[PDB]
Enzyme design. Structure first.
Site, PDB file in Angstrom:
ATOM      1  N   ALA A 231      13.236 -11.738  -5.733  1.00 26.80           N
ATOM      2  CA  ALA A 231      12.332 -12.737  -5.182  1.00 26.80           C
ATOM      3  C   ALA A 231      12.007 -12.438  -3.728  1.00 26.80           C
ATOM      4  O   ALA A 231      10.836 -12.404  -3.339  1.00 26.80           O
ATOM      5  CB  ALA A 231      12.946 -14.128  -5.319  1.00 26.80           C
TER       6      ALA A 231
ATOM      7  N   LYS B 229      11.657 -10.001  -1.949  1.00 32.98           N
ATOM      8  CA  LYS B 229      10.680  -8.963  -1.653  1.00 32.98           C
ATOM      9  C   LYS B 229       9.262  -9.446  -1.910  1.00 32.98           C
ATOM     10  O   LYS B 229       8.320  -8.982  -1.259  1.00 32.98           O
ATOM     11  CB  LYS B 229      10.990  -7.718  -2.471  1.00 32.98           C
ATOM     12  CG  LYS B 229      12.469  -7.366  -2.458  1.00 32.98           C
ATOM     13  CD  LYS B 229      12.712  -6.006  -1.824  1.00 32.98           C
ATOM     14  CE  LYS B 229      14.191  -5.747  -1.566  1.00 32.98           C
ATOM     15  NZ  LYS B 229      14.671  -6.509  -0.383  1.00 32.98           N
ATOM     16  N   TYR B 230       9.092 -10.376  -2.838  1.00 29.86           N
ATOM     17  CA  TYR B 230       7.789 -10.966  -3.096  1.00 29.86           C
ATOM     18  C   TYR B 230       7.514 -12.072  -2.085  1.00 29.86           C
ATOM     19  O   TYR B 230       8.397 -12.452  -1.309  1.00 29.86           O
ATOM     20  CB  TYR B 230       7.745 -11.491  -4.525  1.00 29.86           C
ATOM     21  CG  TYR B 230       7.536 -10.410  -5.554  1.00 29.86           C
ATOM     22  CD1 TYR B 230       8.615  -9.742  -6.119  1.00 29.86           C
ATOM     23  CD2 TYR B 230       6.256 -10.057  -5.965  1.00 29.86           C
ATOM     24  CE1 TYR B 230       8.429  -8.752  -7.070  1.00 29.86           C
ATOM     25  CE2 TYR B 230       6.055  -9.065  -6.917  1.00 29.86           C
ATOM     26  CZ  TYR B 230       7.145  -8.414  -7.467  1.00 29.86           C
ATOM     27  OH  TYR B 230       6.947  -7.425  -8.415  1.00 29.86           O
ATOM     28  N   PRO B 231       6.294 -12.607  -2.051  1.00 33.64           N
ATOM     29  CA  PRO B 231       6.013 -13.754  -1.172  1.00 33.64           C
ATOM     30  C   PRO B 231       6.807 -14.981  -1.590  1.00 33.64           C
ATOM     31  O   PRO B 231       7.456 -14.974  -2.648  1.00 33.64           O
ATOM     32  CB  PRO B 231       4.509 -13.986  -1.366  1.00 33.64           C
ATOM     33  CG  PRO B 231       3.991 -12.693  -1.778  1.00 33.64           C
ATOM     34  CD  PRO B 231       5.051 -12.071  -2.632  1.00 33.64           C
TER      35      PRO B 231
END
Ligand SMILES: [Fe+3]
Ligand SMILES: [Fe+3]
Lengths: 281, 283
Positions: free
Chosen positions: B59, B61-63
């Site tokens: 998570a 690493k994602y927005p």
């Protein structure tokens, strides 16, 4: 004929890396001190004297002297050999392009007298997909071979064919293409992925059997041959972080393109989920 | 040419060939409504729970709009007791992995694509195990993508974009999105995608409504380390699964094809399931 290079145990690692790509193998002199070899040797003596189990023996099923996953039953290997810095410098250099590595297997073999030699092979049967990896791909397996008896012409020193990792196929090479890995206990033979080789058997007529420990370090992408999830928690937490990592108790990381990792759960690191302690943490 | 849609009772030989030829296909109505339905209900409970404040490997690493439920097998009985042991899915896998041998579940997680997220780049599922990138096409395949629409898949809400035959390309390159065909499906359908096929999640153009919801399961050769490790499931939960379910989740010794004569994931020269003395609902 060019022989296997012997190297001092404190030699610079880049030459070992260099040698791995040129010859495909090399030998370290006196990596393990005598007392370390001695303890491991009597630890293995215990397991050999432990009576035979009655269930099925996947790999043992004539006389096949063999102690599996010695890391669970040999403190000297678990606490000293496995974490040996020289070994892991080599590994980090060697697994540069592939990323994290761990221990697929480490088990004992004894070779009685009058056993025929091995046939020349590549260590690619446990994970047959390696057979299809080209030489140019990042290497994913490294054979580390510990003699615990003398390795001599007589008892069947390991036979290696230098440079043979550059071949497309094994074929049927002749014994006189190989050179001998004669070593003393405490030395280590290190063989690159794809190098052709064969155990020598043992041509002594009467005498003590040759005793070797074979360790395989593979990319964490490869499933370990031996799973150490049954080790008791207290035994695991007695190991160093690095030792826990090698035996699959922590989350690992193949190199980018994998930016996340592997062997994880709940999107967390396994060691954190398990609330894991360690000798050096 | 579009993705072929086949009935669930379609013949397995025909499906296998479609994977060599097209690289992907679709099964219509594989999962009954009740299964889709209760799987969805179990998911909404996990979506109701605020994400942890600890570290979150994928998570983070994602927005901060990443809707993601990892390893649904551990919190969704329907997946762990029914979907994951679906006879058709395993008939396909047995055929697809014929030459490599035993397979198991590297991962199975939930994604939700909220309204307004752009197109995902064209990729291949070869980032978790990069060694896959170097295998020749002739090699026995080692990975297989099974894609479960849990909501409707349409072009507006970004149905999966698949490029048929693109596994035979040497490179991926940067193709344009009209080379792809769309995997418009209803819940209950399944999208089967071979190793090395180029594809992308389309995104979500809709301005309102339910996010597109998908469960992605990756069946890999047992030679490859599972992304998700299910070793922390409580034993009682494990023992209420079928043998097959237990094998899918790493709890048993598996066997790659010959020349591996022994197996893999064993200990004390014995099968993991025997060392554990592990029971199963059908044992
Ligand atoms: Fe060998
Ligand atoms: Fe994908």
């Amino acid at each position: 004929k060019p022989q296997l290079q012997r190297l001092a145990a404190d030699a610079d690692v880049d030459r070992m890396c260099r040698l791995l790509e040129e010859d495909g193998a090399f030998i370290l002199k006196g990596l393990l001190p005598f007392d370390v070899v001695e303890s491991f040797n009597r630890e293995l003596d215990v397991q050999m004297a432990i009576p035979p189990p009655k269930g099925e023996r996947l790999l043992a099923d004539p006389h096949f002297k063999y102690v599996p996953n010695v890391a669970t039953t040999c403190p000297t290997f678990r606490n000293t050999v496995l974490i040996n810095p020289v070994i892991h410098a080599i590994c980090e250099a060697y697994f540069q392009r592939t990323g994290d590595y761990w221990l697929s297997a480490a088990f004992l073999r004894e070779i009685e007298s009058g056993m025929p030699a091995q046939p020349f092979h590549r260590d690619d049967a446990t994970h047959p997909l390696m057979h299809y990896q080209p030489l140019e791909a990042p290497p994913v397996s490294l054979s580390v071979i510990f003699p615990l008896t003398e390795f001599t012409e007589e008892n069947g020193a390991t036979e290696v064919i230098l440079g043979s990792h550059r071949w497309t196929e094994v074929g049927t090479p002749e014994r006189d293409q190989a050179v001998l890995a004669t070593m003393d206990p405490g030395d280590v033979l290190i063989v690159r992925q794809r190098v052709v080789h064969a155990g020598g058997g043992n041509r002594t007529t009467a005498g003590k059997p040759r005793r070797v420990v074979l360790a395989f370090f593979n990319s964490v992408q490869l499933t370990p041959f031996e799973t150490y999830r049954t080790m008791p928690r207290e035994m695991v937490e007695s190991m160093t972080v690095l030792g826990q990592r090698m035996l699959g108790w922590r989350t690992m990381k193949p190199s980018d393109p994998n930016i996340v990792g592997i062997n994880l759960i709940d999107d967390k690191r396994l060691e954190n989920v398990l609330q894991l302690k360690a000798a050096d943490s």
